[PDB]
Amino acid sequence: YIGSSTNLIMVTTTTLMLFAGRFGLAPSANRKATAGLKLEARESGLQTGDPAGFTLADTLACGAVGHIMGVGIVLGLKNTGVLD
Amino acid sequence: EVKIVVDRDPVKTSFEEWARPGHFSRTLAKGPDTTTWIWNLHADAHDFDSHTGDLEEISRKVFSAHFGQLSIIFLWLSGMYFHGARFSNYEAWLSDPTHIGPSAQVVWPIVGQEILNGDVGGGFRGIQITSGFFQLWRASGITSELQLYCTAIGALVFAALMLFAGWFHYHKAAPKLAWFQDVESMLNHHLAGLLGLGSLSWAGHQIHVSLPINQFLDAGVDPKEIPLPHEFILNRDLLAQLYPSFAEGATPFFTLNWSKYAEFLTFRGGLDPVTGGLWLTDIAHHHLAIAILFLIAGHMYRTNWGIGHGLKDILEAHKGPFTGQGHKGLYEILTTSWHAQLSLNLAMLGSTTIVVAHHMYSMPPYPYLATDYGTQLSLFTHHMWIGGFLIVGAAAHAAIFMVRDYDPTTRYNDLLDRVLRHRDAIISHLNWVCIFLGFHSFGLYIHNDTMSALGRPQDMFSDTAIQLQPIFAQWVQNIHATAPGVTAPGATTSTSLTWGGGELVAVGGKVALLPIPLGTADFLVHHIHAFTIHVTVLILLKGVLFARSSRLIPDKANLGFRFPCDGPGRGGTCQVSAWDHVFLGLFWMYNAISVVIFHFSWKMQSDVWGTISDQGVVTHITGGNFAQSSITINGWLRDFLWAQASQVIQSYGSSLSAYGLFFLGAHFVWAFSLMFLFSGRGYWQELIESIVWAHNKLKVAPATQPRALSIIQGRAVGVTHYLLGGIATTWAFFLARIIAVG
Amino acid sequence: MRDIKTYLSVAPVLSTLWFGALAGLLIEINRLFPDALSFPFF
Amino acid sequence: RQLWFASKQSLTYLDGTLPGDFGFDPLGLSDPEGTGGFIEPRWLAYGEIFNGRTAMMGVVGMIAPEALGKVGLVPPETAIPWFQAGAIPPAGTYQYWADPYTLFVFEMALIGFAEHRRLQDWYNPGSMGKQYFLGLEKYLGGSGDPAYPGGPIFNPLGFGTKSEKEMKELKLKEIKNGRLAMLAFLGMSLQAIFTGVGPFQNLLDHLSDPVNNNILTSLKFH
Ligand SMILES: CC1=C[C@H](O)CC(C)(C)[C@H]1/C=C/C(C)=C/C=C/C(C)=C/C=C/C=C(C)/C=C/C=C(C)/C=C/C1=C(C)C[C@H](O)CC1(C)C
Ligand SMILES: CC1=C(/C=C/C(C)=C/C=C/C(C)=C/C=C/C=C(C)/C=C/C=C(C)/C=C/C2=C(C)CCCC2(C)C)C(C)(C)CCC1
Ligand SMILES: CC1=C(/C=C/C(C)=C\C=C\C(C)=C\C=C\C=C(C)/C=C/C=C(C)/C=C/C2=C(C)CCCC2(C)C)C(C)(C)CCC1
């Protein structure tokens, strides 16, 4: 049961969320978005091994949001079988 | 950032003070030169903000007080569970709950009160109860007195633990300011931590213990040989026998094909004919979804990390054209004055209590609850009363905040400033609306009664005469009855049964719910409710808005929150303090609640409750005369107030006789209140003077110089006695009537 | 210790215990003499 | 200080006082603005030491009997998983040289004696070597720090010969072995809660058959 709908959806959503974080397309730990635009990065003080300052919080928050958006886009499975 | 900073051992646990009353107030600690001292002592005990000037100490004090409150609540729960264990017939009640009266209190045979232990069935004698615990204890599958016993023990343990925690946190490790004043993490937790995980763990306890044992009992088994709860989780094969899907461990959940669990988590709706209650599958799905919702909500605000919002970063953005600068700085007001928070929370809590009261009857959650009439009725009216009291308290403390801790120099705001800048317009327009509603909602009753007593029925306000139709309510009911067709396919029936579509649910020859039609009488009663609510709002809002300074007295605030008057000058200035505004509004809130609960009782006993025949003909408890006798006050006397007051008045020499006795004392106090509400003081002062003379003549004049109560305390004792009389009267009436007939 | 003594001598608690004792005496008399209407001693 | 998932609230108090500070604390518990009782950094090092030591002893002991039963000569009368030994009644039991409950309260009283005395030492260091103890008095003074008691009762062979460096090595070893034993214990217990067959038999399994990979099944059963 690997590589199927659930697998591909979850992995692509979480990987694109993490990339949006690490490349500057997500308002992660050291980036707070205003009313409109996003690129307002400011520091929190959570130096970690990541070269772009990614603590063990944003790398978890982005994952949680990716999994939520995945579950939501997949459990609208009204066109790929209501039971898998 | 945010840390665990606290302080060590401010105050020592020394009894040095208990022997010196009023240690907190400098004046009180001097000594009781007169008798008003011992009133003023109790009167300002809990008044923490008048004992210091810094918020740290009063915050510590309220932190300890909350523990005291929780200890009392735990002790009460323990007493309840104990009396259920050692003194109830709970097992016999579980045997068959159709026609066995829940009793959980026996009385000692000493002074002839043996009659109190009336016949309740099931080989038991005891004062019948209406608290409604038994439906809960059957929902949670207690089904054994050992469980009640051990639960009472654990509750006692938690009570002592909370009392300890209290003592320790005030005396030994007192929290500091930057802890209290840090609301971000508090919101974060209480959203995610307390409520969410609470509902989640309860969904646990329901899907793993309640659901199977309840389904077994519905199948019909003596609870003696019903398998114990833990023996439903240890050995899987039982639940396997019940639910095929449930024998698949955790694969169907993690692998996102949740539909397998569809059996025990579903979205049926409606009620369950086996017990009239809710399909426990539905309530489990509810609690679980709510848990998930609270957990995902809890992660809003930045606390220590770099993600999340800040409650200061949310308000100041909102600033519209008309109002101007918006909510700037409001964050500081609601973080630097406890009374503000107390008012806000009391208002929201009263509203939630009211909506709980409403949603209870129309959607009976528990099983075999919509057929124990008295329980449903008593629960609803109790919740209504609690909500009303909470709302009035909210208004009072809002006024107190307005007086003391409001100041534009440092606790500034540009929104409340505008609000206060045009108070007169608000109060004027609300007053006019109150007059309009009063006229067009009570004069209608007066006209109807008069045109009745004048032999002109065809000029009345009813369905058979000049007609007023509540069209919007019937519109909404039609929509709710046709919504499960297209809008909400995932449902099975309407959300409840009270919507104007479907069939009726009846268990044990009695009905529980069925459609509810609305007649012109409902229109009139709804407008009466609207009017009375508007008038109470008028009173309390005027008090709050004018607590600072009125166009009558220019510097009212300087005179303080609670003072009797400003002398008889300028034509008399009686009852100008916001405190007196609350004193007034209390009566009107009482009246609103009273008429609401009377309407509820009559409507239920005239259109829903009752018995069902073998063939299926319904004969309601009162005969269905609402839509034809609620439209005349004389009717209210005749059809409802007089008639349905029989069972309380013949109640002497029976089990219910206690309900009879109160029906007089309730009235009596009720009288008594007038003596304080009408008279003044100077008269009583002179009378006390002459009595002091009569005593002093015999060398008995006490050094605790007698003094007639101060004005404010007179009004307070009056209003308390009056509320007590009214509520006790309606209480005795309700209980006697419903538990006798029903 | 003496502080708790002076506290115990404060009228509320003293009154509560006194009234409890009196009520106990009365209810015990009523138990040992049910309905006790007249004075059937002299 | 090999930084693995650190933060700044960690470095507020984790300034290198514990032997071998690695810098791993996102939450920042023991911030010294207000010293929380039992959140004291001294108490934290004490706790990690004590926990890791207990975990070492437990991971040896819980696994010892059945394991030894494999190709050894401890009889099959005790060839039982640690989680089936009897501590977990829903798993197994055994007829012992007493009854279950009184045995438990008795061992609780003994461990209570030991740890109460140790705690009293913690509050007042050295203060056990005053009162009558039917002997044993001239030993329980310790080596000053309740963290490290020393004493020929607890220093028989004699190490850290004339040194603090040797003590630093031996001791790093202590923290590392404590953490490793913690991991192994937690893993054995999680397998036990999810596998249901026993650790040593799980090794019996994972020696030959690679395809096991029971994270794929995630089967949650007793
Ligand atoms: C580092 C860090 C950092 C950041 O900041 C955060 C975080 C991440 C959170 C952290 C982490 C941590 C950790 C991992 C920890 C771990 C711990 C443990 C595991 C412990 C154990 C611990 C453990 C323990 C005590 C245990 C012990 C045990 C024992 C003795 C045993 C006993 C027994 C036996 C013999 C057998 C029988 O039949 C039964 C019994 C009775 C069972
Ligand atoms: C490249 C690289 C890297 C990276 C990698 C990666 C990419 C990783 C990933 C990672 C990840 C991938 C992570 C994740 C995370 C996730 C999470 C953490 C999730 C969670 C989830 C949850 C918690 C869920 C929840 C829920 C439930 C349970 C039910 C209801 C619904 C919901 C959904 C809410 C490294 C660093 C190595 C190094 C450098 C290089
Ligand atoms: C024996 C005696 C006497 C007399 C007495 C009397 C005559 C009394 C009366 C009394 C009256 C003439 C009346 C009364 C009434 C009472 C009441 C009325 C009470 C109540 C209480 C309560 C406690 C209630 C409660 C409640 C309710 C029911 C409602 C709301 C809720 C609650 C639960 C809070 C003499 C002087 C010879 C001597 C001394 C002793």
Cα separation, B708 vs B552, whole angstroms: 29
CB contact under 8 A, B19 and C27: no
Question: Which residue is closest to B14 within chain C, CA to CA?
Answer: C3
Contacts by residues B353-360 (CB-CB < 8 Å, ≥ 24 positions apart): B353/B383, B353/B384, B353/B386, B353/B387, B353/B390, B354/B383, B354/B384, B354/B387, B354/B388, B356/B383, B357/B381, B357/B382, B357/B383, B357/B384, B357/B387
DSSP helix/strand/coil, B466 = strand
Contacts by residues B571-578 (CB-CB < 8 Å, ≥ 24 positions apart): B576/B550, B576/B552, B577/B547, B578/B396, B578/B399, B578/B400, B578/B402, B578/B403, B578/B543, B578/B544, B578/B546, B578/B547
Give the B window 245-274 contacts with C, CB below 8 Å: none
Whole-number Cα distances in Å, B470 to B181, B439, B545, D209? 50, 19, 35, 76
B726, B594 contact by CB (below 8 A): yes
According to DSSP H, which parts of D70-131 are helical? 100-123
B511, B612 contact by CB (below 8 A): yes
Closest residue (by CA) to atom 3 of ligand 1? D25
- Rg (C-alpha) for chain D, rounded Å, is 22
Distance D214 CA to ligand 2 centre (A): 20
To 10 degrees, the CA torsion angle through A20, A24, A25, A28? 80
Cα separation, D64 vs B400, whole angstroms: 70
Residues whose CB falls within 8 Å of the CB of residue B173, separated by 6 or more in sequence, listed in order: B6, B7, B8, B9, D37
Give me the amino acid identity at D174.
E
For B619, the enclosing helix (H) or strand (E) is strand B618-620
Classify the C-alpha dihedral D212-D214-D217-D221 as positive or negative.
positive
B709 assigned to a ligand binding site: yes
Q: How far apart are the first and last CA of chain C?
A: 51
CB contact under 8 A, D7 and A49: no
Of the residues C3, C8, C13, C27, the best mutation for testing chain B's interface (the one with the most B CB atoms within 10 Å of its CB) is C3
Give me the amino acid identity at D39.
I
Cα separation, B347 vs B358, whole angstroms: 17
Kind of pairing, strands B510-513 and B505-507?
antiparallel
B343, B337 contact by CB (below 8 A): no
SS (H, E, C) B414-456: CHHHHHHHCHHHHHHHHHHHHHHHHHHHHHHHHHHHHHHHCCC
B675 assigned to a ligand binding site: yes
Q: What angle do CA B193, B199, B203 make, to 5 degrees?
A: 135
Q: Transcribe chain C into DSSP letters.
A: -HHHHHHHTSHHHHHHHHHHHHHHHHHHHHHHSSS--S-TT-
**B466 - beta bridge partners?**
B461
SS (H, E, C) B180-208: HCCCHHHHHHHHHHHHHHHHHHHHHHHHH
Q: Is A64 in the pocket of ligand 2 (CB under 6 A)?
A: yes
According to DSSP H, which parts of A3-57 are helical? 5-23
Cα separation, C24 vs D159, whole angstroms: 75
CB contact under 8 A, A83 and B259: yes
Question: Which residue is closest to D32 within chain B, CA to CA?
Answer: B5
**Structural tokens at position B611:** 């018995």
Question: Topology of domain D8-207, per CATH?
Answer: Chlorophyll a-b binding protein (1.10.3460)
Of the residues D2, D8, D9, the best mutation for testing chain A's interface (the one with the most A CB atoms within 10 Å of its CB) is D8
Q: How far apart are the first and last CA of chain D?
A: 42
Length of chain D: 222
Q: Which of D121, D161, D167 is nearest to D144 (CA)?
A: D121
**Structural tokens at position D107:** 């061992």
Q: Resolution in A for the shown PDB structure?
A: 3.9
B651, B659 contact by CB (below 8 A): yes
Of the residues B14, B15, B42, the best mutation for testing chain C's interface (the one with the most C CB atoms within 10 Å of its CB) is B15
To 10 degrees, the CA torsion angle through B358, B360, B363, B368? -150
Cα separation, B105 vs B83, whole angstroms: 7
**B461 - beta bridge partners?**
B466
Classify the C-alpha dihedral D16-D20-D22-D27 as positive or negative.
negative
Cα separation, B475 vs B518, whole angstroms: 11
Q: Is B666 in the pocket of ligand 3 (CB under 6 A)?
A: yes
B94, B74 contact by CB (below 8 A): no
DSSP helix/strand/coil, B652 = coil
Q: Transcribe D56-70 into DSSP letters.
A: HHHHHHHHHHHHHHT
| Residue D218 touches chain B, beta carbons under 8 Å | yes
Within 10 angstroms of residue B92's Cβ, the number of other Cβ atoms is 16
Whole-number Cα distances in Å, D91 to B208, B564, B649, D193, D222? 20, 74, 64, 11, 9
Q: Which of B729, B738, B740, B741 is nearest to B661 (CA)?
A: B729
B681, B675 contact by CB (below 8 A): no
Write the DSSP symbol of residue B709: P
Cα separation, B235 vs B228, whole angstroms: 11
Cα separation, D7 vs C32, whole angstroms: 78
The strands making up B610-612's β-sheet, listed across from edge to edge, are B505-507, B510-513, B610-612, B618-620
Q: Is B437 in the pocket of ligand 3 (CB under 6 A)?
A: no
**Structural tokens at position B175:** 């929290």
Q: Is B672 in the pocket of ligand 3 (CB under 6 A)?
A: no
Question: Which residue is closest to D39 within chain B, CA to CA?
Answer: B4
D121, D128 contact by CB (below 8 A): yes
Q: Is A18 in the pocket of ligand 2 (CB under 6 A)?
A: yes
For B175, the enclosing helix (H) or strand (E) is strand B173-175
Side-chain-facing half-sphere of D19: CA atoms under 13 Å: 18
Q: Which of B323, B348, B361, B307 is nearest to B604 (CA)?
A: B361
Whole-number Cα distances in Å, D46 to B131, B435, D6, D17, D51? 52, 74, 21, 12, 9
Q: Which of B135, B141, B374, B379 is nearest to B275 (CA)?
A: B135
Q: Which of B396, B733, B374, B389 is nearest to B592 (CA)?
A: B389
SS (H, E, C) B477-514: HHHHHHHHHHCCCCCCCCCCCCCCCCCCEEECCEEEEC
Residues whose CB falls within 8 Å of the CB of residue B412, separated by 6 or more in sequence, listed in order: B329
Cα separation, D96 vs D98, whole angstroms: 5
- Among left, alpha and beta (phi > 0; psi -120 to 50; other), residue D142 is left
Which subunits sit against C, judged by 3+ Cβ pairs under 8 A? B
For B147, the enclosing helix (H) or strand (E) is helix B145-171
